[PDB]
Design a protein around this nucleic acid. Structure first.
Lengths: 105, 189, 132, 314, 138, 27, 62
RNA sequence: ACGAGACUCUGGCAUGCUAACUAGUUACGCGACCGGUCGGCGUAACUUCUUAGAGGGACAAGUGGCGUU
């Protein structure tokens, strides 16, 4: 999770399910950031992977889900318009000169 | 102008009640040459509440769902109601339809009591729009009660349907049910 | 079932409060100011935001909306706030004063004032609402 | 001054005065655009039966038109659309004739000069390309002419060598000559940004502003600032008329006009009745059209009614 | 001659080919007057012939709408008649005639020309039809 | 901070080994 | 059973466990003395002019 | 912050597809008959149905009533 946060993703949740301690099985998950669970923008905005790890007691399942930033290849920066989510891009406001007289060259 | 052939006219309808100007729409631009032209009143925000009488007759007769399949049949029975009532009465079929349904039908029809009622009914002052529409409903269901499932030869069953709906013969079952409704209405009085 | 979701309300209020000069009673202006600064990525959303800014403009001609603040309405209100009446309200020629406050002023070495007018107090001494 | 009375009521239109670049034309046939996905026309009858009859519906278009102009001859014209289609409309039968793409980004109108040989419209898409009625690009006009989003470029029917100027939504205005081919000066420093403005056809006094309704007049002779004068409200029409030194701004409920005597409000000369289309916010103005004779005026509104000043004294 | 107005009701395949002549509509080889349903005849013949028989002699129209269903080609023929007349009088007479013929064709039909996207609806699993399930739970 | 005993306790806070894990966590 | 053009200025809304019963307060056109409140089925819109058929036996309750 | 909504696919809506031998077709070369078998070479403008195949907008530049407006 710390890696994914340092990777630049704005959210990740991982779940390890099965036997971790004892005869019975626990489903233990950690989630941080944001994560959409519904709608279309879960295919092109969330990456999900399911894997299995064997153990002397049994099999542990690992589910990793990651959010992706806005612009492709991990948020390089704004490019040709391909809008996919809501954003408020606030530019720098115009500034007027304080001096009563205008610029002289 | 537009009329029916060189022998019939459609500008002979004047009731002048000054009360059919809020639900029966004749005010500004709702006129049609067409008896029915594929209305889309479903998609509208309940813009179907200014419906005329001919379309009520068109849409309030079928028993169960055993007529739908082609609105061809709806428009054809509108046309043949036009022509058959014209043959019966020798004048404008819609005019005599109104004449023979107003003089009878619901004076105080079926409507409940207070917040919930099924024991008896209430003698309710029937609004002119709903009285006219439900009288046309009475005629339509009586037509599908008498013309349909008749033990006699069916080319005068609209005449006997008019008789049952207005004059009050003890033939139609709907008219005796309405007689019980009227007995309740008088129980109110 | 036409309640505007907080997304629509926040976007519309921000757009109105920010660039109200460009915003009149239309839709393409809203889509343009969106695609310029804060682009919204759908179509039904843009239609609903245009509808809500239209409604807010209809409600904003009659008076200032609670959640919005234009430079124009703030300017009008600050001019009203800076209003300085020509003659003060406290500059009365004569001030009615009861005998008890008159005695109080006398005890404060302010009894020699001439702008006061001793007014006869209430004849009776009942001032409470009947209990019940 | 002048005494004027309003005659004849408008009853057969839904259009505006959206954008008509000042061009000499007959007083009978006038053209304009609208926001009804259609192109409207103006036939003059001077009757109460119909204040204006569209001549022919130039059909074939699926979008609104933000710029339409017919030239002195009916066989030369220009137009634009929100997507930017440049369609050649004949007035004889009201049908399209030829098709191109004119507006790379939806712009207020196309540029005009004293030569009328450069076809360039403003674009926000950063893909400036030359347009030519021939269909061949002789040279690409790319730099030193449009630094940012350009709002409008006015006609230059002057008696001197051609100087033209480009006005934009980015507090800028650029001078341009076909004998200079260089950028002399570029101005900046307004309080608010721009919507639409006019300019001097002879490059003497440039009118800028619109975030408050003030016309700041730059001097292009040396590239410095001349002065700034107050006009109307927040609109895309701050029109220093070329025919009239008068200043006209339809603000609030009135077309406020400032004269040379005192530059204040003198005459309203209004004889127009009220309407339900004005019970909302007061009518604004978007563009104005002046007759080449200095006699007739056509002003639009957001009131759906088109106002006309006519010299008939009936 | 191009008017570009067509006539299209429901999903019927129609053609409106315009060239000067009499206005006739061919349906299964049966012209406008003698029609295929043989029961909705007056409702389609009333608007045109009561005003004039040479009224359709302006521009002939190949109208070969291969429509199946009576509600399909019926009222499609009148859609075609109204649309062809309105477009011809629009492009090739003048604006005032446009206004008056549009007024008469609008008192013919206020607003029912174009509909919303809808048809017979899909079926869902768990039941025999669109909105129906298996045995009942009373 | 030791996490092994914390996880063992968090799996079952009132199990057979709850007292020993809680005691080991105290100090 | 009076007969008059009843000027309706009071329609409150629908009430009833079948939801088709609107309570209309029939007021007489130029009387301003008496009014009747009735539970009736059907769309009886605000401001309409009812046909007066009966001026007693108001909407029953309980 | 997640869910709801937004989102996606889908449905009796388009006179632009500088669009099509499967679908008729402005001026060719077929042609009895009161500008057509040029869809029986193939109209380079087509397009109207068909391709629901690709690019679009229009519930508030609305009205009345109820509601703390």
């Amino acid at each position: 999770l710390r890696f994914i946060m340092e990777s630049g993703a704005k959210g990740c949740e991982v779940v390890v399910s099965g036997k971790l301690r004892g005869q019975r099985a626990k489903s233990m998950k950690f989630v941080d950031g944001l994560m959409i669970h519904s709608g279309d923008p879960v295919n092109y905005y969330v990456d999900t992977a399911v894997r299995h790890v064997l153990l002397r007691q049994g099999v542990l399942g690992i589910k990793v889900k990651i959010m992706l930033p806005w612009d492709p290849t991990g948020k390089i920066g704004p490019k040709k318009p391909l809008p996919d989510h809501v954003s408020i891009v606030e530019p720098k406001d115009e500034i007027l000169p304080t001096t009563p007289i205008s610029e002289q060259k | 102008d537009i009329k029916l052939f060189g022998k019939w006219s459609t500008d002979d309808v004047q009731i002048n009640d000054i009360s059919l100007q809020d639900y029966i729409a004749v005010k500004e631009k709702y006129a049609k040459y067409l008896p029915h032209s594929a209305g889309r009143y479903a998609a509208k925000r309940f813009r179907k509440a200014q419906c005329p009488i001919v379309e009520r007759l068109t849409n309030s007769m079928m028993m169960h769902g055993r007529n739908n399949g082609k609105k061809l049949m709806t428009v054809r029975i509108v046309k043949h109601a036009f022509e058959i009532i014209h043959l019966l009465t020798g004048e404008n079929p819609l005019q005599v339809l109104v004449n023979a349904i107003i003089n009878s039908g619901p004076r105080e029809d079926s409507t409940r009591i207070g917040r919930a009622g099924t024991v008896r009914r209430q003698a309710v002052d029937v609004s002119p729009l709903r009285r006219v529409n439900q009288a046309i409903w009475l005629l339509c269901t009586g037509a599908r009660e008498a013309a349909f499932r008749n033990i006699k030869t069916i080319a005068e069953c609209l005449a006997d349907e008019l008789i049952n709906a207005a004059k009050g013969s003890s033939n139609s079952y709907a008219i005796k049910k309405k007689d019980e409704l009227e007995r309740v209405a008088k129980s109110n009085r | 079932g036409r309640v505007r979701t907080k997304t629509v309300k926040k976007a519309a209020r921000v757009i109105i409060e920010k660039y109200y000069t460009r915003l009149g009673n239309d839709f393409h202006t809203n889509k343009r100011v969106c695609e310029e600064i804060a682009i919204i990525p759908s179509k039904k959303l843009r239609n609903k935001i245009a509808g809500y800014v239209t409604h807010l403009m209809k409600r904003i001609q009659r008076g200032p909306v609670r959640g919005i603040s234009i430079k124009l309405q703030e300017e009008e209100r600050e001019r009203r706030d800076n209003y300085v009446p020509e003659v003060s309200a406290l500059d009365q020629e004569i001030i009615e004063v009861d005998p008890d406050t008159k005695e109080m002023l006398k005890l404060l070495d302010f009894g020699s004032l001439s702008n006061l007018q001793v007014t006869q107090p209430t004849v009776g001494m009942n001032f409470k609402t009947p209990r019940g | 001054t002048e005494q004027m009375t309003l005659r004849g009521t408008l009853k057969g239109h839904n259009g505006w005065v959206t954008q008509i670049a000042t061009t000499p034309q007959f007083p009978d046939m006038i053209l304009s655009a609208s926001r009804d996905k259609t192109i409207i026309m103006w036939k003059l009858t001077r009757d109460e039966t119909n204040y204006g009859i569209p001549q022919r519906a130039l059909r074939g278009h699926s979008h609104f038109v933000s710029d339409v102009v017919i030239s002195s001859d009916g066989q030369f014209a220009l137009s634009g659309s929100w997507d930017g289609t440049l369609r050649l409309w004949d007035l004889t039968t009201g049908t399209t004739t030829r098709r191109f793409v004119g507006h790379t980004k939806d712009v207020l109108s196309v540029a005009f000069s004293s030569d009328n040989r450069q076809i360039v419209s403003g674009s926000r898409d950063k893909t400036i390309k030359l347009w030519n009625t021939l269909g061949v690009c002789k040279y690409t006009v790319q730099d030193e002419s449009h630094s940012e989003w350009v709002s409008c470029v006015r006609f230059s029917p002057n008696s001197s060598n051609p100087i033209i100027v480009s006005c934009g939504w980015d507090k800028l205005v650029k001078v341009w000559n076909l004998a200079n081919c260089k950028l002399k000066t570029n101005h900046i420093g307004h309080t608010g940004y721009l919507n639409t403005v006019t300019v001097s056809p002879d490059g003497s006094l440039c009118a800028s502003g619109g975030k408050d309704g003030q016309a700041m007049l730059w001097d292009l002779n040396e590239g410095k600032h001349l002065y700034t004068l107050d006009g109307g409200d927040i609109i895309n029409a701050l029109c220093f008329s070329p025919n009239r030194y008068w200043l006209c701004a339809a603000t609030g409920p009135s077309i406020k006009i400032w004269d040379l005597e005192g530059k204040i409000i003198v005459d309203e000369l209004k004889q127009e009745v009220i309407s339900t289309s004005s019970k909302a916010e007061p009518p604004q103005c978007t563009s104005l059209a002046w007759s080449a004779d200095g006699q007739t005026l056509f002003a639009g509104y957001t009131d759906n009614l088109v106002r006309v000043w006519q010299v008939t004294i009936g | 001659q191009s008017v570009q107005v067509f006539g299209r009701k429901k999903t019927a395949t129609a053609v409106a080919h315009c060239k000067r002549g009499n206005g006739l509509i061919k349906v299964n080889g049966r012209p406008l007057e003698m029609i295929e349903p043989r029961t909705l005849q007056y409702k389609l013949l009333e608007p045109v012939l009561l005003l004039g028989k040479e009224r359709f002699a302006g521009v002939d129209i190949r109208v070969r709408v291969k429509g199946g269903g009576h509600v399909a080609q019926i009222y499609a023929i009148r859609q075609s008649i109204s649309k062809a007349l309105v477009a011809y009088y629009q492009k090739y007479v003048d604006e005032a005639s446009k206004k008056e013929i549009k007024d008469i064709l609008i008192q013919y039909d206020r607003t029912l020309l174009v509909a919303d996207p809808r048809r017979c609806e899909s079926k869902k699993f768990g039941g025999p039809g669109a909105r129906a399930r298996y045995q009942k739970s009373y | 901070f030791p996490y092994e005993v914390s996880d063992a306790l968090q799996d079952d806070p009132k199990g057979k080994y709850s007292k020993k894990l809680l005691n080991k966590l105290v100090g | 059973q009076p007969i008059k053009l009843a000027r309706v200025t009071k329609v409150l809304g629908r009430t009833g466990s079948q939801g088709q019963c609107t309570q209309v307060r029939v007021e007489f056109m130029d009387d301003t003395s008496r009014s009747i409140i009735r539970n009736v089925k059907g769309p009886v819109r605000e401001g309409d002019v009812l046909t007066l058929l009966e001026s007693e036996r108001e909407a029953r309750r309980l």
